[PDB]
Design a protein around this ligand. Structure first.
Ligand SMILES: [Zn+2]
Length: 223
RNA sequence: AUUCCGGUUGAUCCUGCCGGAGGCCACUGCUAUGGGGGUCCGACUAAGCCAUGCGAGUCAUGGGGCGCGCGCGCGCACCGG
């Protein structure tokens, strides 16, 4: 139904859009680990239809910024938004706007275009299951003054982290994690970007064939 | 729950302190139906001050006396352990 509904009224402008409209590329994993540029949010609307439901579109922050022209001062809105399916795909965006609606829509489109793919597993000394309910190993991210360290935890231990990270990890599909932070967490933008980069850096650790079985590692969607 | 939230600017990122939010102990305001268990109740200030009465005795299988009874027993103080 809605698949073709959206596909019909979309006229592509890029080669990736054209391939996704035709049907050469059918799965979401086919666009990622090649140096493709992603300039249309319709690609992601079509391949990941879960990122249009309101349940998957957290608005994280609204800020009121000021510019001086006295002259009189001019008021603007900055919006920070996250989107994602709860099975391995999350993105984050910022939007300028003169009105909050404009800001929000721009932020969500930039979030769709800034989409990544993560890994999941179990690497805690206290569960040793082989199911993907957490992260498989410990990772570190940074932005500005904020430093985030994410550690694997056991089942039933729900997201021991600040709220911004709670939302981002929920959307990425993580259920259990321990955290250490350093710096100024009250800058929501930088706290969020640090968590996002920590999740991205799950793909920069080198592993071996046995680690996959040992930790139940999963790249993207499960099952 | 190996956690963060507010505050310095016309707006921003930092440093850095104040404050919030949890637990235990003591005093206190308002209010209060019941049963059970426990190693709780002048320690912090005065190891400051007092009245009344109690908190350490026992032995007739160590000895003499006296009394109350019926050579047998019951009691009183005393010597002695
Ligand atoms: Zn586990």
């Amino acid at each position: 139904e809605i698949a073709q509904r959206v596909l019909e009224e979309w006229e592509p402008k890029t080669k990736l859009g054209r391939l996704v409209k035709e049907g050469q590329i059918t799965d979401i994993h086919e666009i990622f680990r090649k140096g493709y540029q992603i300039k249309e949010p319709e690609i992601v609307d079509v391949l990941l239809p879960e990122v249009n439901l309101r349940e998957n579109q957290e608005v994280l922050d609204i800020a009121l910024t000021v510019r001086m022209t006295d002259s009189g001062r001019r008021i603007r809105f900055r919006v920070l938004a996250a989107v994602g399916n709860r099975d391995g795909y999350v993105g984050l965006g910022i939007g300028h706007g003169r009105e909050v609606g404009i800001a929000i829509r721009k932020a969500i489109n930039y979030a769709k275009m800034n989409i990544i793919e993560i890994k999941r597993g179990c690497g805690s000394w206290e569960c040793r299951c082989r199911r993907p309910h957490s992260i498989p190993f410990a990772v570190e991210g940074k932005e500005g003054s904020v430093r985030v360290k994410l550690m694997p935890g056991p089942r039933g231990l729900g997201l021991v982290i600040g709220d911004v990270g709670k939302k981002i990890l929920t959307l990425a599909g993580v259920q259990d994690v321990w955290s250490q932070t350093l710096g100024e967490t009250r800058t929501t933008v930088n706290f969020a970007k640090a968590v996002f980069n920590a999740l991205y850096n799950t793909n920069r650790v080198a592993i071996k064939p046995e680690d996959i079985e040992r930790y139940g590692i999963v790249v993207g969607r499960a099952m």
